């Protein structure tokens with residue numbers, strides 16, 4: 001029954017940075033890891049811009065206590081370009097790297113041999129089998145799924161995924177952590193896409209196909225879903241927000257797992273934007289352009 | 292270009308009642324039609340109850356203004372059990388009856404006989420091809436789709452659908468009418484489900500399949516979609532809200548136009564609830580139980 005205090009987050013992208021932010025904002029020590037020192041600097045800078053907003057809401061009439069919160073949270077976030085030299089002693093490792101099974105497995109097979117025994121390994125994957133990633137180590141009882149939602153500082157949901165090997169103890173800890181993070185945990189079975197993604201991704205593709213079919217423009221499709229279904233964002237806005245590259249990897253993943261399923265049929269327009277390095281908000285341009 | 296002023300709304304259910312309510316609230320002469328006098332009585336009663344919730348808000352600080360808004364609106368709504376007696380002097384007929392092609396054409400074939408020459412016909416259908424419905428008359432140039440969203444008094448979207456035969460003059464009148472209702476009209480191609488239904492319904496079916504499979508529960512699936520995607524309602528809360536009968540009808544229609552399509556595969560759980568007459572909130576029970 002380990003209490004999570006020291007957290008290691010691998011990947012300082014859209015999800016990783018946010019996870020680190022929230023983890024730090026709620027009094028946990030965090031070590032954010034990524035490829036280069038430039039990347040980290042960018043992630044850390046992003047986490048700050050995100051904290052300024054969270055600032056106006058918790059400390060509006062208090063500018064002094066405003067900076068305090070921001071400085072302290074950034075301070076509780078250490079950075080490193082070497083995972084192995086950080087996970088030697090950590091309470092939990094939350095992986096948030098490229099959506100690719102092979103790459104994730106290699107990373108965990110490696111860290112498994114460095115991290116202390118009590119350490120717990122968690123994948124924030126959107127569409128992969130926790131069991132498949134977990135069986136890349138010899139710590140499956142301490143391996144599980146811990147899925148966050150973009151933007152991590154806003155979305156309250158966290159899907160805690162147990163594999164048939166995950167221990168109750170591992171589970172409970174991750175549950176407590178989720179609540180310590182001020183999030184709402186929901187235990188899910190280890191099925192592709194879990195809940196939210198299994199239902200949101202297929203829907204996002206369809207909206208693309210409706211566009212590819214020639215029946216409507218992206219703008220009207222977005223307007224329609226927001227004013228008609230009350231959705232926060234149109235399906236194309238959301239795609240761009242989440243990242244076209246990430247969406248593609250998810251879909252290509254499910255496609256291999258079952259090519260006959262017409263619901264995993266990859267999109268030409270999506271693949272073309274990715275091949276042109278237009279991943280949405282990330283690169284400054286996806287279906288839409290951003291300044 | 293006719294200026295829609297008098298509107299005959301056929302169907303005093305979830306949509307019709309709302310369509311007549313909004314039209315009334317916006318200074319349009321309305322006639323609400325339904326099968327029996329009792330049914331119309333409950334409808335009118337519902338619109339009144341709905342009008343006050345709106346009063347309590349939109350006029351919270353002015354009771355008189357609220358009272359007058361309620362009375363004045365209910366006052367513009369007349370009831371008749373036979374639309375054929377009313378259409379000869381109406382500007383627009385917005386049909387909002389059971390989702391059934393046969394039964395919709397029947398109604399329109401009849402009305403086409405009694406309606407004034409300038410009268411525009413509009414179906415609020417969610418899944419059927421307007422061209423089909425329109426071909427039961429010889430008024431195709433004055434026939435079109437005007438799709439609203441539940442609940443009508445809140446949702447701002449209105450899909451205005453032209454068939455290849457709809458006249459520009461007819462289209463503009465509907466757009467002007469949509470705007471007069473305080474809505475945001477979106478011109479859509481006459482294709483199954485237009486925009487929103489075409490994207491939303493298949494998703495709702497997937498949420499159902501996720502459940503029948505045993506992967507998760509309805510409650511967690513709803514929590515998951517709300518907290519993770521920001522949706523106003525979980526899929527099951529929404530199915531019950533919309534009506535399981537209507538939903539089932541929507542899917543069966545599509546399932547027959549493309550039996551193999553996995554998107555429109557019928558649901559055992561949904562069919563069984565419909566058969567047991569549990570259509571959702573309107574019947575006091577659907578996937579969930581209400582008061």
Ligand SMILES: CC(=O)CC(=O)SCCNC(=O)CCNC(=O)[C@H](O)C(C)(C)COP(=O)(O)OP(=O)(O)OC[C@H]1O[C@@H](n2cnc3c(N)ncnc32)[C@H](O)[C@@H]1OP(=O)(O)O
Pocket residue numbers: 228229230341344345348417439440441442443444445446487488491492523524529533541
């Ligand atoms: C295939 C097809 O069939 C096509 C379709 O139409 S698909 C269905 C489309 N509609 C949707 O997807 C529904 C999604 N849900 C929603 O957007 C929202 O939950 C909602 C519009 C129903 C409102 O929910 P809500 O915000 O929680 O309101 P609720 O808490 O229910 O009621 C309180 C407020 O809502 C309003 N309200 C809710 N239902 C209302 C109604 N029937 N009439 C008038 N007002 C209503 C009140 O005026 C009230 O005002 P305040 O905010 O100032 O307090």
Ligand SMILES: CC(=O)CC(=O)SCCNC(=O)CCNC(=O)[C@H](O)C(C)(C)COP(=O)(O)OP(=O)(O)OC[C@H]1O[C@@H](n2cnc3c(N)ncnc32)[C@H](O)[C@@H]1OP(=O)(O)O
Pocket residue numbers: 050051053054057125126127148149150151153154155196197200232233238242519520521
């Ligand atoms: C791929 C997978 O496997 C799983 C995934 O994650 S799927 C994607 C999951 N996420 C969603 O579905 C995205 C849907 N979109 C949303 O829910 C909403 O658009 C949203 C939460 C981003 C808010 O957007 P919005 O409605 O346009 O409002 P916005 O003005 O942008 O923000 C609203 C509030 O949140 C804050 N905010 C938004 N983004 C923020 C961030 N990155 N950090 C901290 N605060 C933020 C704002 O300061 C604002 O606060 P106030 O209202 O008090 O002033």
Ligand SMILES: NC(=O)c1ccc[n+]([C@@H]2O[C@H](COP(=O)([O-])OP(=O)(O)OC[C@H]3O[C@@H](n4cnc5c(N)ncnc54)[C@H](O)[C@@H]3O)[C@@H](O)[C@H]2O)c1
Pocket residue numbers: 010011012013014015016033034035039096097098099100107124125126127147148149150241242243246250
């Ligand atoms: N985009 C979303 O909204 C969203 C939400 C939930 C989960 N996910 C999932 O979370 C993961 C994170 O996606 P993301 O949006 O943050 O993508 P991202 O591209 O923004 O972030 C990934 C980060 O991984 C880093 N990285 C790659 N290989 C690495 C390695 N070996 N060691 C350290 N860092 C490495 C990259 O430099 C990058 O900064 C994916 O598996 C995705 O399916 C995405």
Ligand SMILES: NC(=O)c1ccc[n+]([C@@H]2O[C@H](COP(=O)([O-])OP(=O)(O)OC[C@H]3O[C@@H](n4cnc5c(N)ncnc54)[C@H](O)[C@@H]3O)[C@@H](O)[C@H]2O)c1
Pocket residue numbers: 301302303304305306307324325326330386387388389390391394398415416417418439440441532533534537573
């Ligand atoms: N349920 C929704 O939320 C929703 C949203 C948008 C559009 N729609 C579409 O709008 C239509 C309206 O559905 P609804 O939710 O109001 O259903 P409903 O079951 O609540 O209302 C239907 C009404 O039609 C009446 N009716 C049935 N046959 C009739 C006939 N021959 N002549 C006159 N009246 C008749 C019934 O007495 C009832 O009051 C359907 O075509 C549906 O596809 C439904």
